[PDB]
């Protein structure tokens, strides 16, 4: 589902356009960006413990760089947790 919405980038090429879109999306959406990134990360996180490894690793990175360039709710705690979950993958 999250992949269809094209709200969070998963390949590095889409980061530029997805980042620009966030600027004009309703604040009722930007509010919940924090929980979306974490759920999506925790999703990739779970699928990793179950090539594919490279693909998840690449997508993991994408989420981080997006979150890094986006100023949003609880960006502090969220950006940190996102980075930790990516380290455990490797």
């Amino acid at each position: 589902i999250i992949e269809r919405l094209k709200l969070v980038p998963l390949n590095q090429e889409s980061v530029e356009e997805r980042v620009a879109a966030f600027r004009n999306f309703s604040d009722e959406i930007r509010h919940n960006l924090s929980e979306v990134l974490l759920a999506t990360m925790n999703i990739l996180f779970t699928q990793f413990k179950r090539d594919r490894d490279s693909q998840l690793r690449s997508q993991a990175r994408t989420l981080i760089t997006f979150a890094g360039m986006i100023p949003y709710r609880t960006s502090g705690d969220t950006n940190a947790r996102l980075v930790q979950m990516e380290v455990l993958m490797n």
Binding site: I1, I2, I43, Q47, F48, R50, R52, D53, Q55, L56
Partner: protein
């Protein structure tokens, strides 16, 4: 997508028999090791193994088939048929799309099993309406599995019948593959002697042999063609069939692949409906260019090419996508793939200038 390591372990743990297979329509692959079965989603990078180890005897064939309507709850998308040396077992399957890549997959027991009988099962095919047909390497007979919702006192939930019935006086011959064409309610079998048999599903539970065409007939047809060739003789084997649906062509029913790389297109006609006659009409001969590392510098009918000799496996998909597994060496396969030159075909004028580009 690399085969996950956890089945490579199970494969080497094999004692007598192992087999691999594909469920491409839902994006799953499978491996059987003796009396055990393992499914996995190959699109996934770190796939979980869905195992089924209840089987008591060696598994010889598995297939994924549509369910019979009005038998199971709607959340069951498919039926998993598992043939062992002892039983044919049916399992319920739900391949619902949770939520991102491939279809999440769950198995359901059904309490439906039939004795395998004396005839090996290596080929399982299914129809649109959930009919299940069986065949193998013991003989040419085609079996069908019936299964029902109700428990009845006089019948059973799950049965198996033989649609062929031979008398005494037999000859050694067995099957190489089974092929369904739902658009014409036809079933095709291919034997080791390269005999093509056509069966008609005239009724919902009836199956009737209506054509039997041996290699000799194909060769006689081929002789009466303007161009005979050393690539098709009585030594040649037909290694695969591929039915052509009625929506693609009226006359041409079937394509047959020889081990020399020739594609034979057979027509079939009624005398009036099931067909009663089958005839070899058109041949597409192999290409000449062999695969090279270095590029090479590039009108008569080429009927002698050996670039596809030997063809071990062959598949045709509408509207003419052809895959040929050429086993030139005992170690590596080369893949020959072709498609109709759609551009030139629709530009060509007039109708009489049309060739299979």
């Amino acid at each position: 997508h690399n085969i996950p390591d956890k089945v490579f372990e199970h494969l080497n743990a094999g004692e007598v028999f192992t087999k691999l297979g594909l469920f491409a329509e839902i994006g799953y692959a499978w491996a059987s090791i003796d009396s055990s079965l393992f499914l996995w989603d190959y699109t996934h990078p770190n796939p979980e193994l869905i195992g089924y180890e209840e089987a008591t005897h060696t598994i010889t064939a598995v297939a994924l088939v549509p369910p019979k309507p009005g038998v199971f709850v709607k959340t069951i998308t498919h039926v998993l048929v598992v043939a062992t040396t002892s039983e044919i077992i049916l399992l319920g399957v739900s391949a619902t799309p949770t939520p991102s890549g491939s279809k999440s997959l769950t198995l359901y027991s059904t309490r439906m099993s039939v004795h395998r009988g004396g005839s090996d099962v290596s080929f399982i095919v299914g129809t649109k309406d959930g009919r299940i047909f069986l065949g193998g390497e013991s003989d040419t007979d085609i079996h069908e599995i019936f299964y029902q919702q109700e428990e009845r006192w006089f019948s059973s939930r799950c049965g198996k019948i033989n649609h062929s019935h031979p008398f005494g006086s037999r000859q050694q011959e067995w099957l190489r593959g089974l092929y369904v064409d739902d658009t014409r309610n036809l079933l095709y079998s291919l034997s080791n002697r390269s005999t093509i048999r056509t069966y008609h599903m005239e009724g919902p539970e009836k199956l009737t042999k209506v054509i039997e065409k041996d290699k000799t007939s194909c060769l006689r047809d081929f002789a009466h063609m303007a161009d005979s060739s050393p690539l098709f003789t009585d030594k040649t084997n037909i290694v695969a069939l591929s039915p052509i649906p009625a929506t693609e062509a009226s006359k041409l029913h079937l394509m047959a692949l020889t081990d020399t790389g020739c594609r034979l297109f057979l027509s079939a006609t009624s005398s009036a409906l099931a067909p009663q006659s089958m005839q070899l009409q058109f041949v597409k001969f192999p290409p000449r260019e062999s695969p090279t590392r270095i590029r090479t510098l590039n009108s008569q009918l080429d009927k002698t090419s050996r670039a596809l000799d030997p063809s071990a496996l062959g598949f045709r998909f509408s509207p003419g996508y052809f895959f040929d597994v050429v086993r030139k060496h005992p170690n590596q396969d080369m893949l020959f793939v072709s498609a109709p030159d759609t551009g030139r075909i629709k530009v060509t004028q007039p109708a009489s200038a049309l060739k299979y580009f």
